[PDB]
C-alpha cells in the first residue's frame, strides 16, 4: 500500500529543458 | 656528470604517487554547480578539455 518518489518540480526554463543550473 | 642531461618531467613513480593522492574526503558531495564537481575522480574524464574519452 506504499508508492513514493523524488519530486520538487520545475518546468523548462527560458532555455526550456536540459541545461540545468539557472 | 653522471646525472641525465635534462631534468625529467612527465607523470610520477609509485613512491611519489602514494605521498601524493591521499584519499579524498568529500563533504556535502555534489553540492555545487556542474563544471565545479570533482570531475577528475571519473576514470575516463580527459581533464585537459572537460570531455569524457569514448571508444570512437
Amino acid at each position: 500500500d506504499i508508492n513514493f518518489a523524488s519530486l520538487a518540480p520545475r518546468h523548462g526554463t527560458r532555455p526550456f529543458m536540459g541545461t540545468w543550473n539557472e | 656528470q653522471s646525472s641525465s642531461s635534462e631534468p625529467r618531467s612527465g607523470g610520477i613513480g609509485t613512491l611519489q604517487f602514494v605521498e601524493e593522492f591521499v584519499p579524498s574526503v568529500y563533504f556535502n558531495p555534489f553540492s555545487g554547480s556542474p563544471g565545479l564537481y570533482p570531475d577528475e575522480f571519473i576514470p575516463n574524464f580527459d581533464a585537459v578539455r572537460e570531455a569524457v574519452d569514448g571508444y570512437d
Partner: protein
C-alpha cells in the same frame, strides 16, 4: 488434459536513453556516491502467511 509447452529460446532485451556522454558520466558520478543510493519497497509490501 494433454496441454504441453516447449521453449525454443530466451533472449534478454535492454534499451538505453542515448544520453550525452559527459552528461551521462556526470549523472553516473553522482549516482556512484553513498549519499545517493537508490531504494525501493515491495510496491504493496507485507509478510505473506
Amino acid at each position: 488434459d494433454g496441454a504441453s509447452v516447449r521453449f525454443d529460446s530466451v533472449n534478454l532485451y535492454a534499451t538505453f536513453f542515448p544520453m550525452a556522454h559527459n552528461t551521462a558520466s556526470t549523472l553516473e558520478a553522482m549516482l556512484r556516491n553513498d549519499t545517493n543510493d537508490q531504494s525501493f519497497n515491495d510496491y504493496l509490501s507485507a509478510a505473506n502467511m
